[PDB]
Every structure is written in C-alpha cells, then in structure tokens.
Design a protein around this ligand. Sequence first.
Ligand SMILES: [Cl-]
Ligand SMILES: [Cl-]
Ligand code: NA
Lengths: 67, 67, 67, 67, 67, 67
Amino acid sequence: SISARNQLKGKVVGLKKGVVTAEVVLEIAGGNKITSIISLDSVEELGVKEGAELTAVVKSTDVMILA
Amino acid sequence: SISARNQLKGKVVGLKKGVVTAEVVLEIAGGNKITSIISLDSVEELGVKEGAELTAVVKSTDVMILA
Amino acid sequence: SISARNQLKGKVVGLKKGVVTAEVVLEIAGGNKITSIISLDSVEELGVKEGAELTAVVKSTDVMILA
Amino acid sequence: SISARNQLKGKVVGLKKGVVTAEVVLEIAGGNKITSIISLDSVEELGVKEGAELTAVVKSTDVMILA
Amino acid sequence: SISARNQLKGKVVGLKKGVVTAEVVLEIAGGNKITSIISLDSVEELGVKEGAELTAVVKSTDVMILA
Amino acid sequence: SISARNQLKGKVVGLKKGVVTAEVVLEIAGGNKITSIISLDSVEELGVKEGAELTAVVKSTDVMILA
Ligand SMILES: [Cl-]
Ligand SMILES: [Cl-]
Ligand code: NA
C-alpha cells in the first residue's frame, strides 16, 4: 500500500469540526485513543462519522520514543 | 506532561542502528507494531535495547486517516 | 526522557485559542520567539497561560537548515 | 520569506554524515543546541562545515509544548 | 537556500482563513494541485491572496510513497 | 482513500539505499521533481526500483509557503 509503517485500526469515538482543521479520535486495541488533526475538507469528503471503522496512519519518522 | 496526544506503551521487539538514524520497533496492545525512526544519538543516550518497556509518542497533527 | 533532541525553555508571551487548534508563543534565551500550533485540548489540559514557564520540544527530523 | 515561523540563528558545532541522511548541530542564543537531521545531498550542496553561521528553521505545526 | 528538497512554483487558486490556521491551494505545473495548512499569522504577514505566484515547500522526510 | 491532500503521480528516476533510510526521487508532471526519504524496509517491501510508476504523498500540514 503506502510506505507509512504505522497503520492502526479503530472506531471513531470523537469528532470536532473547525474552520480549516478537524479533530478525529479513534479507539484502538487495548482501549488506547489516537487523536488526529487533519483538514476539514478531508473529514467531509471521507464522510467521517461517530462510530465509523477507520485506520490511523503515521509515518515512521514522526514517531518519538519516551524512555 | 507533553502536548503530544498519542502515547502508546509497548515492548522493544526490533532495533537497527545506522550511521545517523536508528529504527525502533515496539509491540503494543493487541499485537500492533509501532515503527519509529529517530537519531542514533538518542537511541544510545536512552539505552534502548531489545525487550525494554518504552512508550511511542506521536503529535496529533502528524496522524492521517485512512478510509 | 524523550528522544526529541530540541528542548528550549521559555515564558509564554502569546496565546490564541481556536476551535480545534491553538497557538502558543514562547520567548526563549536571547529574545528569540518560538511559535507552536497544537490541539486546543492539550492547551486546556495543560493549563497554558500567559506568563507561564514551559518548554518547546521539536523532533530532529523536523528541523531544516537555511544558508 | 517563508511561512515557517521559527528561525533561529547559530553556529555549527557538530556535523555527522550518513549514507542517506546527515546530522547538523547548531549552537544558538543561551548556549542551547539545535539538532537537525536532513539529506546528505542538501548538506553537501549547501556546503555545511564546522564553524559556519547558519539558521535552523522549524514549521509551527511541528512544535510541541512540555508543561 | 534552504535544505528542503521539494520546491514547487505555483499560483494561488484557493484561500480559506481560520482562527489559528489557514488553507492555501496552489495550481502547479503539469496540472497538479498542492494544499497547504499553515498559520493565519504567516498568511497575513506574507500578503497571500488569490492570484499570487508563490512556491510550496516540503521537507524530504515528510514525503511518503504509494504503490 | 487517505486524508493526505497531496498525491502526485510520477516515475522513479533515482534510488539510494542506506542502513535505516532510503531516498527516492520521482519525476512528476510538468517537469517537477519530488524527493522522499522513507524507511529502507518500506522501499524493499514495496519493490521500489528505478523506472517504477508510483505516487508521492504529503500531508497538508507539512507544506510551507515561500514568497
Ligand atoms: Cl544494529
Ligand atoms: Cl484566545
Ligand atoms: Na512532525
């Protein structure tokens, strides 16, 4: 598919629409919550809604380690 | 406490050291695997090693939605 | 301790709250000003306020060189 | 100039060349150190060298707050 | 000269201002379109308007590959 | 469908493998060139080779504006 190595499946538990951006919160395995801030245009075009099953995607070079 | 909203606990299952960067692979809840590319310097100062328990951190503005 | 190599201490001199995001401006050593755009949620959970002493954090792979 | 709001002037105190990437460390005001990981091609083309006076640049959406 | 390896000349065909951020859409050579989300402050300081001729800039480490 | 708003079709004209990362250069429509730095693992898993027809993908929040 795509080079981004992090692909986490989950369900939408939160949605907040802005003017330029929008926030999507997904509940994944173990009950952890992933928060995404993307364009309002993409949220609308993809038809994001509470309860939908979507996948969070993250490029490897954007992941930090806390030790 | 840091603003980055995504913080996922896991165990180190893969580690590869380059010249400038290094790759850390974490196994988190549900079997999901997180891949991180960071500086070699940080991997050495943090003492990252296979089997260690660490946390992956990702800023909300870097998470995309696939669906 | 986090892998992100850039950690700069400063004082909050500007704060603007949007619908989804928020802007924090920090004055660091030498008079330099750091601008951060993060989630509104994090700005509220952290209790960020003008005059507060906080730290700006930036991952090494996000820093470019101009010259 | 450019939209990236963070522009920090400094002097090169460290340089490490990889195969694909390279690390540049700059000393800025207050003695803080900024670490950048960019392409080896750009380090070579810009002629980066120990002691040179350059500027570190960071997009606002890549800056986190630690409180 | 900046290290960011992707520099695409274009014309502004879309501009949407928010509270904290702003969206800029550029038409570039070959019939492609680029969408940028940056600070409202930078859009105003740069004098961005529909019809302006500007350049979109992306760091190499932020570009993914889809197959 | 992914939320990333920038999707540019091209042909691979350059490939350089490192230890941890890898550099891919694509020629896109209109005579523009895109440079991507991703994981070596993804380059190998995707079967990236010179001459391949692939798509470069960038999140809107990573695109700056130069005037
Ligand atoms: Cl190794
Ligand atoms: Cl406000
Ligand atoms: Na980032």
